Amino acid sequence: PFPTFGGSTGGWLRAAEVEEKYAITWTSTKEQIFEMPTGGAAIMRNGENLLYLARKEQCLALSTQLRTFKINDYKIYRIFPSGEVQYLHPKDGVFPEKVNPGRTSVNSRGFSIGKNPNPASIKFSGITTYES
Amino acid sequence: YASELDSMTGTGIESPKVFDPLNLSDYVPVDWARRAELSNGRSAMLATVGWFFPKVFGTFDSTDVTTTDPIDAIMQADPQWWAQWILICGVFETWKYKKEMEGKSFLGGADPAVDYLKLWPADAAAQEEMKTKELKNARLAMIGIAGFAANHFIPGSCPVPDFIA
Amino acid sequence: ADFSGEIGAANAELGCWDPLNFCTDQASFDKMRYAELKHGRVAQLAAWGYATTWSGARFPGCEDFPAGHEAVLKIGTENLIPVLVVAGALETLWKQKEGSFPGDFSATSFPVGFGPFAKTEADMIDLRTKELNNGRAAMMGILGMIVHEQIDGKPFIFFDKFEIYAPFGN
Amino acid sequence: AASFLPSILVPLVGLIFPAFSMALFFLYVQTDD
Amino acid sequence: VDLDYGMKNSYVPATGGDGGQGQFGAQSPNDWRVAGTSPVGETSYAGAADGGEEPWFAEAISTVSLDLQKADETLKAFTKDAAAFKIEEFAAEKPYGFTSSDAAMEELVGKLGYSKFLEMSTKQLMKTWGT
Amino acid sequence: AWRDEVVVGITAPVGFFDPLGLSKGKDDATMAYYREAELKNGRVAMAACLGWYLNAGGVHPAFNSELSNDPLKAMVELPAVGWLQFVLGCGAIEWLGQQIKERPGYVPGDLLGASYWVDNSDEGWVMYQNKELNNGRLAMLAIVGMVYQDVFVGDYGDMMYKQL
Amino acid sequence: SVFDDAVKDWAEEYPQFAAWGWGPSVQAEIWNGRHAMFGWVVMCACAYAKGHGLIPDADQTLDLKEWGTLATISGKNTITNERAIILIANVHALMVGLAATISPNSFADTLLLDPNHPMYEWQMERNSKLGGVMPNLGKMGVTPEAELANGRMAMMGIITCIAYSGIQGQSMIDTINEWVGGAYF
Amino acid sequence: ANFIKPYNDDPFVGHLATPITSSSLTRALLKNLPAYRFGLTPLLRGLEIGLAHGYFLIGPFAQLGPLRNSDIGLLAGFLSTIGLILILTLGLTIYGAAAFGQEKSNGSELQTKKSWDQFKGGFFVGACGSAGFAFICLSSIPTFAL
Amino acid sequence: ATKFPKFSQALAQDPATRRIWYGIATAHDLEAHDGMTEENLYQKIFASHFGHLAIIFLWTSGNLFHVAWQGNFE
Ligand code: CLA
Ligand code: CLA
Ligand code: CLA
Ligand SMILES: CC1=C(C#C/C(C)=C/C=C/C(C)=C/C=C/C=C(C)/C=C/C=C(C)/C=C/[C@@]23O[C@]2(C)C[C@@H](O)CC3(C)C)C(C)(C)C[C@H](O)C1
Ligand SMILES: CC1=C(C#C/C(C)=C/C=C/C(C)=C/C=C/C=C(C)/C=C/C=C(C)/C=C/C2=C(C)C[C@@H](O)CC2(C)C)C(C)(C)C[C@H](O)C1
Ligand SMILES: CC1=C(/C=C/C(C)=C/C=C/C(C)=C/C=C/C=C(C)/C=C/C=C(C)/C=C/C2=C(C)CCCC2(C)C)C(C)(C)CCC1
């Protein structure tokens, strides 16, 4: 289900084969030309499409472009060398910009930025003021 | 001495049993030793002849080397000869490698690596006897070339015929 | 038909290099093979002879004769006739062994054959191939020499004559 | 003679020493204790 | 699917100045520091791809890929808890002739697929499951 | 059968050209040898032609332009060391070529391995290949003609278009 | 004083080097000893040559033009031929040593103990049973034991020669000649 | 006709199959080079590589060095080459230690500690010997004149 | 840590060349090293000072030595 592309010297390298790799998938209603983050132009297929990239940002950048084409069914995965796959985005099925009941707060401090502790107070502690 | 020596060619009439008084077999691997024994021996066999051949039977028609003394000619000879000599030896060494990899043997094996005269016996009995003769002649030659050199530098060290000098 | 199996094939791919399709059947091939061998053997001796003479060596009683084709033209025919007589006799003597490769004269009166030289079949094939190949080379060689002799007088192209190193012969 | 020391030490201090030191640092920083 | 495969890495968070393993782990379990190319007929990076007659470009031979079928499974596994929360709330709001959470899930996902199910409010779900 | 498959080399002026029928009974291997020889002999000829032309013209800016403008005289003047390098270098390439030939899928004459990207189905490819062959065939005859002129007629320059 | 403790402490303080056999180890004792034994020959040879005037054109300095500033001791002053020749002899030897260190055989005693060398086990074993204060007789002849004993002897001699030379205020070459009976000179 | 295609038919890998990258010539040359050739042992691989690199290195030093015009120029050139070989050998040793570690198992894989050590040794012998060969050759240069 | 910057896990676990660069330039900021107590800090600083003093004296010794052995003071 690979989109039609002729190849580039800006594709993935060894890290994709020995450390980690990424993959995005989407469905289209027409064959159209899009610009790939790696560099160049490609033609998507009329239906399912799969593409591999080396960075999550590269994948999410393409998603932005896809939204312009009115495609909002994209999914991003991380494939480890052993074959293990992790579903990353949309994580809970709902885009992050939309509040979804069932999501808990993380890394939240209940005070204004100016209420953090003084650096000297936490000296020889190992923690930082913003983590204190 | 190493046990394998008991099952190898080399012991004969003048040496009924394994000769390794200092048990060098303990240190040097048995295989490497035989390979080296033959290599140094075969080369020595050729040297002995070369030590006197130019003197006794004459020299080629050239003036690069004027002396006949075996040692002196080494420096008189043009360097180009020496370079080509190293090259030919390298070629020989390569041949032994490639042919050995083809299953052939240059150490008394079943399939000869170099038998241009086609005189390698088929029967194992004769083969064994043939190998023994080569080893002997080789050992004798090594001793001889050493002797020649000795008398050359330290006169009287060895009983060498005058012509051989 | 397929003479690739025959000794002397150019190589595994080309098989028998017969550009003009002289050979058609085994019968013809045998004819051609016999001829090639004969010419080859004759040539091998010829090159040896030409070189020996051109370089200067002469038999007792032949110290004033010239060398090369010039000899054939100048030397007395009477002293050349012996060659024909000694060759014609051989022509009659050599006897081809039936059911054997062309050029096998094992059936000759005097003992002739692989004798002690060859043991295995492979050894025989090798010696045979070498005889043929060396003959092929000489055939070209003797021509090359004669031609150049006529062209410039230098039968060896790069040097006038050979110098031999025969220690024992001295 | 001490006079020969300049010609015996300088070659060592400026060439041998720096080399070995750099090698050791590389081996030290490329090792994962 | 081992949902902790990524978390199970050699990374050890430091005291101060580190966000941590986050949600999906901070580093790949595997070490990128593998060797270079090897002679024909040999392998280097463990489960590497044989370069055949071009060992020099072996690293360009892909061996890591995503199976579309397998892709479905990873989607379901990593979003299992979310689905659970969703159906639970639907159950809490007095479902019409409710049966079993799982049963309801199957019915509700039989229609509206699965992705659509994950993106629907309990209200919409109840409307959908009115029947 | 080579005759039933060959496409390159057959052009318009004469079509298939074998008046003496030197390829009637030859097998594919022999025919392959012939095509390879044809191309090699031709390609070398083309190069030789260019070399002769440049030297004759006087554009031989090497060795302080010491060597003669006559191409055949110059060869004699060239030191042997120069010739040895030439033969040995070409010999090296010949060895590599043999390796390529052994590899499966070898198309007689292809050392760049263009078979990997293009086949004879493409007309553009076959046409361009034909141009190499045709020019090579002509060059072969030309180099033979020029040598005659230089060795017998006595000239090593154009005696055809020189008269404006 | 127990020797063993000191060695252990060194290993602890400098573990990385100790792993390869560097420092106060049997390996070092063997190798350094071998070199000292060999040197004695070199030093005696130098003495003989000096006394018998064998070295060609000694007491003369190499040309600063043929050779370079590398041959200068101070300013334009250059090294004498004798010292140069002695050095070249040593360089011949050092080259052999470098080859042996960088390109060891499969049945050779490597300078450092490498787990990936086939002789590692034998070397480890030999070293494990070669330690003592007194030479172990009964293992005379060509044995590892004899080698170590002779090596220690040679190394001690070097120390003694230097000391005696200083006490008597003489060159080491002179002391050598003296201990031989004045034969060389 | 397109002479440039995606490498290994993977449109997303960062490489392309150009005539330079994948031609019979390039493939043949690289396959038979000592580094990638099939069958060569680690030692032999190093030896061939060393023999090749040592022969061409004596030139630069001998003809352009500080003592080029001296009668002992060639000798000096040889010594300089040996010095460079030693530096390169140190590098090889250090690289192996860091890249491969301390104990190995696979064996006969240029990419292991034991194999690398053997490779390094071969390089040293070949390089130094090759330089010596050049010394002998450059001592007397043939004019190839009849 | 198990890498070059033993005093910093953060730098030690870095997959780039920064690990080496920063480790060298953050070596003498003993106060920020992982697991540093005030007592240890003072003790290490005191010892480091002894080393600096030694370097200063070695430097002075060299000047005297070289002037005496290769100079023209007299
Ligand atoms: C204190 C340090 C130091 C010393 C002692 C030298 C010494 C020398 N340099 Mg130098 N150099 C240095 C630092 C140093 N350099 C630095 C830092 C640079 C970088 C800018 C250079 C760049 C440089 C260049 C570009 C050149 C030199 C050259 C030379 C040589 C010229 C004299 C001569 O006779 O040449 C003639 C050479 C000889 C007689 C050969 C001498 C034998 C060699 C040196 C043996 C080396 C083996 C050595 C042990 C291997 C090292 C192993 C490793 C573990 C350290 C001389 C040996 C020239 C030369 O010829 O290099 C050899 C030259 O072209 N140098
Ligand atoms: C190296 C020489 C050489 C070789 C090997 C070939 C080989 C081939 N040519 Mg060819 N050709 C050549 C030169 C050569 N050509 C030249 C110079 C011309 C220009 C006139 C042509 C023009 C030509 C045409 C127009 C056609 C061919 C074709 C062919 C192929 C089929 C015909 C055949 O089997 O010929 C067999 C030929 C040989 C086995 C070798 C040639 C015979 C040698 C050269 C004998 C020398 C004769 C000659 C008169 C020598 C004197 C030259 C000069 C002194 C006057 C075959 C692969 C046909 C083709 O491509 O079909 C696929 C085709 O249509 N050729
Ligand atoms: C970068 C420019 C440059 C160049 C070309 C030179 C050139 C030279 N310097 Mg110099 N030098 C330079 C910068 C340069 N210098 C700088 C910046 C300094 C200040 C530090 C010096 C300081 C210096 C000193 C102190 C000395 C020299 C010396 C020398 C000479 C000795 C050459 C030598 O041993 O190299 C050895 C070279 C090599 C071992 C390798 C050369 C590179 C190879 C040939 C590249 C091959 C690439 C290949 C073609 C790729 C394709 C391969 C494929 C076909 C298979 C030479 C004339 C010495 C001398 O006598 O002066 C005349 C000397 O004593 N230099
Ligand atoms: C203080 C202390 C202790 C101690 C101690 C003691 C006594 C320590 C003393 C150690 C001592 C004194 C060790 C001598 C070494 C001499 C060597 C290595 C000579 C090498 C010589 C070599 C390598 C020879 C080289 C040459 O051949 C070459 C290279 C070139 C030739 O031209 C010339 C020569 C021949 C020169 C205790 C009590 C034991 C334990 C306690 O806990 C700590
Ligand atoms: C001593 C010395 C010097 C020297 C020197 C010396 C000896 C130098 C030696 C140089 C030498 C041997 C160079 C050798 C060159 C050989 C070549 C190209 C061979 C090509 C083979 C090919 C294509 C094979 C093709 C095939 C055919 C068709 C049939 C098929 O079936 C199979 C197959 C077999 C594959 C110098 C020159 C370095 C100068 C210095 O100063 C002094
Ligand atoms: C441009 C080009 C090319 C290339 C060229 C080149 C790059 C060359 C190089 C070359 C080289 C670079 C060569 C080398 C050589 C080397 C040698 C030849 C060596 C030898 C050695 C020896 C022989 C031995 C030694 C030794 C040893 C081993 C040790 C002991 C001692 C002795 C001495 C024995 C060609 C033409 C292909 C084609 C076109 C392109």
Curated annotation (Swiss-Prot), chain D:
GO CC annotation terms, alphabetical: chloroplast thylakoid membrane; photosystem I
Gene Ontology BP terms: photosynthesis
Alphabetic keyword roster: Chloroplast, Membrane, Photosynthesis, Photosystem I, Plastid, Thylakoid, Transmembrane, Transmembrane helix
TM region(s), chain numbering: 8-28
Cellular localisation: Plastid, Chloroplast thylakoid membrane
Keyword tRNA-binding: no
S-S pairs: none
Record carries keyword Transmembrane helix: yes
Membrane topology note: Single-pass membrane protein
Domain of life (superkingdom): Eukaryota
Signal peptide: none
NCBIfam families reported in the protein's UniProt record: PS_I_psaI
Role, per record: May help in the organization of the PsaL subunit.
PANTHER family referenced in this protein's UniProt entry, alphabetically: PHOTOSYSTEM I REACTION CENTER SUBUNIT VIII (PTHR35775:SF2), PTHR35775
Family membership: Belongs to the PsaI family.
The protein's name: Photosystem I reaction center subunit VIII
Gene: psaI
UniProtKB/Swiss-Prot annotation, chain H:
Transmembrane stretches, start-end: 47-67, 72-92, 121-141
Classification via Pfam families: PsaL (PF02605)
UniProt keyword annotations, A-Z: Chloroplast, Membrane, Photosynthesis, Photosystem I, Plastid, Thylakoid, Transmembrane, Transmembrane helix
InterPro entries: PSI_PsaL (IPR003757), PSI_PsaL_sf (IPR036592), PSI_suXI (IPR022980)
Chief localization: plastid
Entry's Gene Ontology BP terms: photosynthesis
Keyword rRNA-binding in record: no
Membrane topology reported for the UniProt record: Multi-pass membrane protein
Location relative to the cell: Plastid, Chloroplast thylakoid membrane
Any single GO CC term annotated in Swiss-Prot or TrEMBL for this entry: photosystem I reaction center
Family: Belongs to the PsaL family.
Listed name of the protein: Photosystem I reaction center subunit XI
Classification of source organism: Eukaryota, Sar, Stramenopiles, Ochrophyta, Bacillariophyta
From Swiss-Prot, chain I:
Coiled-coil residue windows: none
Transmembrane segments annotated in the record for this chain: 45-68
Subcellular localization: Plastid, Chloroplast thylakoid membrane
Annotated family: Belongs to the PsaA/PsaB family.
Cited function: PsaA and PsaB bind P700, the primary electron donor of photosystem I (PSI), as well as the electron acceptors A0, A1 and FX. PSI is a plastocyanin/cytochrome c6-ferredoxin oxidoreductase, converting photonic excitation into a charge separation, which transfers an electron from the donor P700 chlorophyll pair to the spectroscopically characterized acceptors A0, A1, FX, FA and FB in turn. Oxidized P700 is reduced on the lumenal side of the thylakoid membrane by plastocyanin or cytochrome c6.
Quaternary context: The PsaA/B heterodimer binds the P700 chlorophyll special pair and subsequent electron acceptors. PSI consists of a core antenna complex that captures photons, and an electron transfer chain that converts photonic excitation into a charge separation. The eukaryotic PSI reaction center is composed of at least 11 subunits.
Protein name per UniProt: Photosystem I P700 chlorophyll a apoprotein A2
Native species: Thalassiosira pseudonana
Included range, full protein: 2 to 75 of 733
